[PDB]
């Protein structure tokens, strides 16, 4: 009944409506700080000189944006990768002009999200579960690290991190393609397959289980009332589902082990999104998508264009226009 | 060729700005989320139904019993995320619903683009930016990107039109 | 910003009309139980 032991029992209690835990001790303050600053900035922050060229970009609602165009703007290119907390600025006005809020938000968020992953391990341990849900979450978490931390590190500037906004995200995407040809990179191709395939299998599994629900209600009520929370018996006939799907393709292309099936459902999108996070993370070091520009030439040496060369034309257009005032020299090396 | 189709749709239709595509994005990424989170949850709330360290062997397709604990899965997610599924039927229907609905929404948006009925612009942004050369958003930044794409890919991408764009008319920022 | 004026009425009814429908259905369910 010691005072520290009583605190410890409350932090790790499985009776709290929301589990706190030791990871939560860090997660709760960092997420609140990031959230509060983000909301305030999104509504009211003044324009930010993201590219360090004294050309401020207006990101907030009160400065003429709507929900789709608004953003918390990345910090000034003049700052690069330098740490820029509030107490390094001569004034909040300076700190706002240079994009200080973006740094505060992304650092608090990445910390709080990392602790979110730890919290998933921790409660699983307090409830006597198996531990690997947090491993599923490492795929979206790694993706957030890639566009908020890793890519700025390799390019030398948080000004090239992804903006906290909807149109800013598309800006990040378009510029990424012009400089890395991400579409032609196999790890992004694997990410598409993980995301397309994940949507596919989500719909498959949902439709197969729904298709084989055991009749338990009348036509005047939701079939959902045929399941009661915590009932011991399964609510659908997996052998009927297997019998349908195995005939739709062929027998051995259909699961009849539910554990194997759900593991497959877990693994496919998780691994696909690991690869696409790794794609951003390695294009951060400028190992770019396949280049087949002028790869086909004829007997004389005329270039014979392919669809890759058409892609390059579009990429060139994005290259020459992006940050139209920020380049003084012919090569955009970062 | 499909990659070229994506980029065409950015530069000419401003398709990323279209709310029907955004609803499709949410359905595809929401579906992939649901797929991963559901698979992982089942696999980490399994009942111990055998002694082997490989837990796959401890399932039998004709068993009546649920192979994982809905009650423990619900408690976990309620305490982790605030809310959780409690109805196995709703959950699997929702997994049908989310990606199917998303794809249907994107199809509606492409039907609009058949007619060049784009959500290309916000009129209020354009009126302000035309009058006020210090007003800049990520929205105006992206349209400049779209204009580069069009002028630079169109001659080779639409060869039947015989577009000849002399160097001096091509939009370009400084140096690049 | 020179926004469409009817945007406000359109937005308000878009929220209000279907939300009110759901609230009506929910409250009369509760008074059955």
């Amino acid at each position: 009944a010691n005072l520290w032991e009583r605190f410890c029992n409350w932090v790790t209690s499985t009776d709290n409506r929301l589990y706190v835990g030791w990871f939560g001790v860090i997660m709760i303050p960092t997420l609140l700080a990031a959230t509060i600053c983000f909301v305030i900035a999104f509504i009211a922050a003044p324009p930010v000189d993201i590219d360090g060229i004294r050309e401020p970009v207006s990101g907030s609602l009160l400065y003429g944006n709507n929900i789709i165009t608004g953003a918390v703007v990345p910090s000034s290119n003049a700052i690069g990768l330098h740490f820029y907390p509030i107490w390094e600025a001569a004034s909040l006005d300076e700190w706002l002009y240079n994009g200080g809020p973006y740094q505060l938000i992304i650092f608090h968020f990445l910390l709080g999200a990392s602790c979110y992953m730890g919290r998933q391990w921790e409660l699983s341990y307090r409830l006597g579960m198996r531990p690997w849900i947090c491993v599923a979450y490492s795929a979206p978490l790694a993706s957030a690290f890639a566009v908020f931390l890793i890519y700025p590190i390799g390019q030398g500037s948080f000004s090239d991190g992804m903006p906290l906004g909807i149109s800013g995200t598309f800006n990040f995407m378009i510029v990424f393609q012009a400089e890395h040809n991400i579409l032609m990179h196999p790890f992004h191709q694997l990410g598409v397959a993980g995301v397309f395939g994940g949507a596919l299998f989500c719909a498959m599994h949902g439709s197969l289980v729904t298709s084989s629900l055991i009749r338990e209600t009348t036509e005047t009520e939701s079939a959902n009332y045929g399941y009661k929370f915590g009932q011991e018996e399964e609510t659908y006939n997996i052998v009927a589902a297997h019998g349908y799907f195995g005939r739709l393709i062929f027998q051995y292309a259909s699961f009849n082990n539910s554990r194997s099936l759900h593991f497959f459902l877990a693994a496919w999108p998780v691994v696909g999104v690991w690869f696409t996070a790794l794609g951003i993370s390695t294009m951060a070091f400028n190992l770019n998508g396949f280049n087949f520009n002028h790869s086909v030439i004829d007997a004389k040496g005329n270039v014979i264009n392919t669809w890759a060369d058409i892609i390059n034309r579009a990429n060139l257009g994005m290259e020459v226009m992006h940050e139209r005032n920020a380049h003084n020299f012919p090569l955009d090396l970062a | 060729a499909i990659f070229r189709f994506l980029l065409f749709f950015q530069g000419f239709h401003n398709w990323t700005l279209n709310p029907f595509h955004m609803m499709g994005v949410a359905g595809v990424l929401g579906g992939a989320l649901l797929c991963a989170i559901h698979g992982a949850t089942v696999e980490n709330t399994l009942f111990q139904d055998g002694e082997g360290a490989s837990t796959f062997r401890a399932f039998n397709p004709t068993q009546a019993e649920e192979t994982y604990s809905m009650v423990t899965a619900n408690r976990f997610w309620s305490q982790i995320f605030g809310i959780a599924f409690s109805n196995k039927r709703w959950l699997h229907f929702f997994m049908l619903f989310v990606p199917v609905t998303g794809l249907w929404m994107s199809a509606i948006g492409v039907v609009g683009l058949a007619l060049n009925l784009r959500s290309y612009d916000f009129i209020s942004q354009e009126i302000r930016a035309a009058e006020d050369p210090e007003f800049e958003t990520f929205y105006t930044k992206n349209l400049l990107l779209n204009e580069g794409i069009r002028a630079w890919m169109a001659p080779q991408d639409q060869p039947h039109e015989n577009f000849v764009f002399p160097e001096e008319v091509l939009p370009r920022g400084n140096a690049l | 910003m020179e926004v469409n004026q009817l945007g406000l009425i359109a937005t308000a009814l878009f929220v209000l009309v279907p939300s009110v429908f759901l609230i009506i259905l929910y409250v009369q369910t509760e008074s059955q139980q």
């Binding site: 409506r17 009160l62 709507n66 009661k228 929370f229 915590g230 | - | -």
Partner: peptide, 30 residues
């Protein structure tokens, strides 16, 4: 009026979060 509208809708969603978590219908076993 459009800033007010965006913020209003956003605030309603946060309030809905609160009720959906703390005033959910409690899951009851079997």
């Amino acid at each position: 009026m459009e800033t007010i509208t965006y913020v209003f809708i956003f605030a309603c969603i946060i309030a809905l979060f609160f009720f959906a978590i703390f005033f959910r219908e409690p899951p009851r076993i079997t």
